[PDB]
Amino acid sequence: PQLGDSKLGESQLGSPGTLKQGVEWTVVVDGEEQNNVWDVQVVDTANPFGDYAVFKMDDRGGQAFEAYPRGTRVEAYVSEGTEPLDNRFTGYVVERRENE
Amino acid sequence: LYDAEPGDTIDITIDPRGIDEEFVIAAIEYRWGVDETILTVVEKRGDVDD
Amino acid sequence: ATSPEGIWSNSGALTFEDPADDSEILFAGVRDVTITPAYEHAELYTIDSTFRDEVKRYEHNVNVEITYAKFSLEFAQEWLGGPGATATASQDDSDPMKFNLENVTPSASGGFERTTAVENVVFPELPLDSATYGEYEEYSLTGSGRSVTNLADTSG
Amino acid sequence: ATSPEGIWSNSGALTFEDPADDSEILFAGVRDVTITPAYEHAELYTIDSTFRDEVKRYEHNVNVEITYAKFSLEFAQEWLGGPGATATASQDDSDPMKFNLENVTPSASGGFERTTAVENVVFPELPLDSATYGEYEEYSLTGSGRSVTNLADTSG
Amino acid sequence: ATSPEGIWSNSGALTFEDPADDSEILFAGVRDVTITPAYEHAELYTIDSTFRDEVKRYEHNVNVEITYAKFSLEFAQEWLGGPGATATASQDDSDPMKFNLENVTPSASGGFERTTAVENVVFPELPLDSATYGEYEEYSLTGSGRSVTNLADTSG
Amino acid sequence: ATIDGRQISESTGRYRSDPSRRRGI
Amino acid sequence: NATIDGRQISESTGRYRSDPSRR
Amino acid sequence: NATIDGRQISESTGRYRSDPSRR
Amino acid sequence: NATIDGRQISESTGRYRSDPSRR
Amino acid sequence: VDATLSRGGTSVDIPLVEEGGEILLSSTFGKPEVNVRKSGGSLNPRVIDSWSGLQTFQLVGKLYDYSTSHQLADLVKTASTTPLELQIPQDAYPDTVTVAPAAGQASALTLEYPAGRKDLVDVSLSLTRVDPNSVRGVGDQQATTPTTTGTGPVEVTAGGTTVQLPSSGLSVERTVGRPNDAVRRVPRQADPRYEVKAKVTNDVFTFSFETLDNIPATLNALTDNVFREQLGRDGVTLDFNGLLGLGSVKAIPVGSSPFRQVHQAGRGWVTVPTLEFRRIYSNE
Amino acid sequence: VDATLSRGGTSVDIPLVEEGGEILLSSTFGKPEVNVRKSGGSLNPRVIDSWSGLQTFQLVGKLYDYSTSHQLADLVKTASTTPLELQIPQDAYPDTVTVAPAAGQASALTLEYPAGRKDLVDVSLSLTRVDPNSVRGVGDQQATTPTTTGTGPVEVTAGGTTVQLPSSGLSVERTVGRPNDAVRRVPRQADPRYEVKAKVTNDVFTFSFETLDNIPATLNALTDNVFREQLGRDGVTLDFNGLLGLGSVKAIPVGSSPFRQVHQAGRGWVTVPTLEFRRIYSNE
Amino acid sequence: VDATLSRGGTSVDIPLVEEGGEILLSSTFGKPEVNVRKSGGSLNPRVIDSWSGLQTFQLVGKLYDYSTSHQLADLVKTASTTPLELQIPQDAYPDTVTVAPAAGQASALTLEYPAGRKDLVDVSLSLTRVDPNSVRGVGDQQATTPTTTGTGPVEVTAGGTTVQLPSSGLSVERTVGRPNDAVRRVPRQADPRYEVKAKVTNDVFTFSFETLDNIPATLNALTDNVFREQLGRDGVTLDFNGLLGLGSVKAIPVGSSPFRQVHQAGRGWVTVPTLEFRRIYSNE
Ligand SMILES: [Mg+2]
Ligand SMILES: [Mg+2]
Ligand SMILES: [Mg+2]
Ligand SMILES: [Mg+2]
């Protein structure tokens, strides 16, 4: 359980938790994590072609739109299973778009 | 293949297409949601942008 | 309260009335009468229990069925005509003749007099001829009233 | 354990109660009484056998049916009135009158006294008039109770 | 093999047992007993023949129906209670009381003794009161057993 | 199912120009 | 009814359909 | 089957589909 | 579900839909 | 026993009672977000399971007053960041689940007021399970069903003409839903995130009746003033005049089949199987 | 009793008789052209209603003559700018309405000639209401059903082989429609505009029968010559030989399921549930 | 009596037997590739028939042992360029036809093992006629069903926890298909070309049961461990433990509604109408 809720000896430690499985991408904007990401595309490509990333997020009252002015730092980290986070993309914002 | 970069070499076997080779990676695209790693092999070449 | 008591069938007086006038439609020679108020009962059961939780009434009617042995031209021609009308032929209209029905029966040893009154009794079909060799013509009506308007002791 | 014994139909005393007050609703002149607790049975089978795996009870009711020959105004007006009320006319509401029922019957050789108690008996239809030429009015109730509340030897 | 012989109904000893203890549940006064093992038969027909190709069995049960004239408080309260319990009221649970049934019957001129044993007989409904004017109460059980455990000549 | 050619071409324009924007002009 | 970025790509052809012969 | 300005945009893949197992 | 040259053009919008009210 | 649906201070009890062998509760479990590979060189596909699952509850029951039915409609239609909590009276479920009206659906709630029944409303609820801590939104829109105390007929007013709907065979159904709310996948939670949107909802009234007398006049008045006229930005005023305790709503018939006149062989009257009205802007 | 469908001097009376409580006349009113806003910051949508409505008539009835049945099919299929006028025997409808065969449909008219049922033809008609003054077009194309006075079997000719269809359980269905006609929205008025196009129509013959004797030969001849051959630009000659008064038509079976051989357990014969033919180019 | 389905050495006899008047064989003939013009200035369209037709066989039968059932599943799922031959015991067909499993379908073979039945399996097959000489491909992939001689309950293992499925009311359905094989049009001949692909097949196990005892514990174990966890690339072990002679497969529940819990009025237990599992990568 969480600390403070187990009467000692009453519960198995760590439960109801289990090992991470699946792929998780986290997006870091100027050093802060973006919570409401639901899709990520990252392209890494040889010299004639531009490396780019597209992040798709849910927003409320335009609050997240304000976090991504042009030129702001964005990092995409990936982890599959219990493997440590790899920084797979670093870049800067060129376009923020919000639509219905 | 989150470790992989363009310029790296990879073994590819596709029996339906008679491929069994080492190729250079020209590009990688990672897509969440669909869980796809899209390897461009040998050379990337454009369209209207070219 | 009144004691439950036997009722003798032959002591009944059945009257039919036009609901417009409250005028008597001539009817006689009954042999059987059944009056049955009814509702559709929904018997409701819950998720985790074998037992019934509720039962609710809907869709009220009074089943009226009468057997009789005397033919009434008035009753028949009123049925044919529909509301407010008398006819000697089938009418191509959608309005059935509504009858007000009342049955008055004394109890077998005089404890009460039972009046049953039923509004807007309609009959889907009318037996005109009901002949069988060596018998008097016997007529069976099945019908539905809207509601019971009176069920009371009507002794003095 | 009590030896199985014959039961004589004419020895049975049937009483009806309002579930609110536990007051008697006057009822007499019984000729037939069937009381049957019933469940639906689901018979369940496995994948590699012709034989039954399990059988399970669902959807409980008590089938009550009574034939009687003494008319009760109280019983009829209680049915018309719905819960906690009496009426002389049909009521336009969705709550049916629930009755508590008790049948007390001695065994033929006095070995035991069978009390059957049934809760929340409802009758979808009430026979008011049930006349047949040359007969006393005989009334049939078919209804469903929620459960059997008591089945015991009440001699002591 | 044993010569076929007449069987006289009044000679049958019917006994009910609890499958937990193999203890006798007191039962008497049988008037009719029908025991019938049954399977669903799939009668299978083929591509252009009119004749039946094959037939297969696919859902076994034993139909048990009993008419009896002596009321058992044990049998009734065991039925109410479900497996391994006795109750004076309806139980809101999904387990029906399973009975082991055995009938023993001599043949009419001593050729054999017919023993029929049926496992896990369950009755969807139990008649508690079955009153008709001028008669002893007659109770009808209908139910299904899982299988016939024994059909043999049990004579010495 | 009738598809509007102006709607498709106008909606996709953002994506058609993007490879070029990635490469300069 | 089909959308790209929430805009409809279906044409507003004002052509009617009405349900076929019952059979 | 879809159309832009009356021309079919569906590919004439000469590929068969046939009815599934009944169940 | 729609494809151009075997690749899906349906957007993987992570939006749920669930069975309508029964009536 | 009885199922509670609540949002803060507001609470509605739904009896979860039905006749005989009817389905009271359906719970569907889904993995809509698994990628099963459509191709590849093996006999069997590779898969990946990397997102929240679906749980859907379909609740069927009956309500014993109209007031509670309107409260249920209001509760379902309301846009609020306060969790909608569901209490299921069956041991296989936790005491409370946080829910959204069905995730993309026009019909989350169906209320039926059938003919010949009094104080007995059929309820069908479709609800999606969501993460209790991931109810996200900015807007707040309290829904109100208009209520009044009359006895009068159902009146359709358009272009200065009022049409009274026949009482005969009169059956009413209301569907309510929130299709503009987003229920979205989350990486490593069991349950999705609920984006509450202060946006357009679904609210539809369906009537069925038999037209018995003044038949041409009644049907013609409706079809002349509603169907053969351009209603503009406005619509029909649909007034219940206190039937079911309901008041006055602004509406329009939508689509290809909102009204139907049916003539059957041997019958001297016209059946209306559907007269369907969607509620329009008036909540200013 | 009768409904009259007419175009200039051509007039067909349709009895509008049916059994029991079957639906004889359905009229659907709609507003396909209302814009209801899918989104927006209101609880309830804004709407705009700016265009013509929709009125659809569905007529079920019977005809007592095959000659009249062919006239009805010819009348429905014909391209002409002369109004198709419908007279309905019910007071809710104006004495005449201008109609198009159902707007987008391949199936405006169904005529069934069932087994048994001598001189009884089942009619189903779908018609769309159009503005009497807004019937527009260039071409006249008179549709003729080929008619002859023989007794002979239904014969199917392809590639010099002729197959006689079994009389046993024989049912015929004909389906007619005009999907290439435009029914178009207009502002400011009640009814749409009808654009009559001298273009391809739908005309389909469906057969149902039971093959009782010479089963391999009969079925093989049809399958080998029609289904296993390429027919090219030409097709199949479908000759009725005077059954129902019908003659010779050029047709082809179209699609995935135009023909089925059904074998049932315990039966010594083959059922053909459908054999479906579409009429091809033949007028010069 | 029996239809023989075979591929070289491997042969299965399917008894074409069913109850009463059920359909044992349906053969559908089609022309999927006929071009019928949508328009043109004619009344009737011009056509062109240039390609192979379609013949679809649907076989309903019954198998009398589980061993033969598994052999049939393996025969249908196998990728091999050895022709699959169908011998039909009816005179309207040639002695052998060459077949593919249904051309684009997830369900070519359905096998039902219903409750109450021993040594009796329901078979539904859908097959497409292909040119004997046009069976083209590279790869052999031998399908095997894992078999064992146990008696144990059906077990579902996910994340270290095993659930035992109730024996009560237990039914199994197995669906097999080859949707990734291409059946393709060829000019100038009757039958299409079969491209055998050593690629992903469809293999689905569906279960139906009643949960009678330890109801929360049983259902919660399944829903917690299978549905509310992320399974990753790995999935669920589905082990038959020798029921029907079957063993252990790796699987996952796929889609929007693979599991349902059903609660009915007046019942003390939970129905599971469906629990669906698709077989995932295992086969080296
Ligand atoms: Mg602890
Ligand atoms: Mg753990
Ligand atoms: Mg790079
Ligand atoms: Mg680059």
Numbering used by the authors:
A (entry chain BD): 2 to 101
B (entry chain BD): 303 to 352
C (entry chain B4), D (entry chain B3), E (entry chain B2): 2 to 157
F (entry chain QH): 317 to 341
G (entry chain QI), H (entry chain QG), I (entry chain QE): 316 to 338
J (entry chain BB), K (entry chain BC), L (entry chain BA): 2 to 285
Copied sentences from the primary study:
The final TTP hexamer is followed by the trimeric BTC, which in turn interfaces with the trimeric BPH. Notably, the BTC protein is a pseudo-hexameric trimer: Each subunit consists of two homologous domains, which have likely arisen through a gene duplication and fusion event. The BPH coordinates Mg2+ and K+ ions that likely contribute to the stability of the complex, and connects to the BTC via a triangular ring, from which three globular domains project. Curiously, these domains show an asymmetric configuration. While two of the domains are bound to each other, one remains unbound. As the binding interfaces of these three domains are equal, it can be assumed that they are free to interchange. This suggests that the three BPH domains may undergo dynamic cycles of binding and unbinding, which in turn may aid virus’ docking or penetration of the S-layer. Specifically, the three folded-back TMP termini interact with the trimeric baseplate-tail connector (BTC; gp41), while the three extended termini engage the trimeric BPH protein. The BPH also anchors three TFs. The C-terminal end of the BPH contains a predicted carbohydrate/galactose-binding domain, which may interact with remaining glycan residues on the S-layer or lipid-glycan carriers embedded in the membrane.
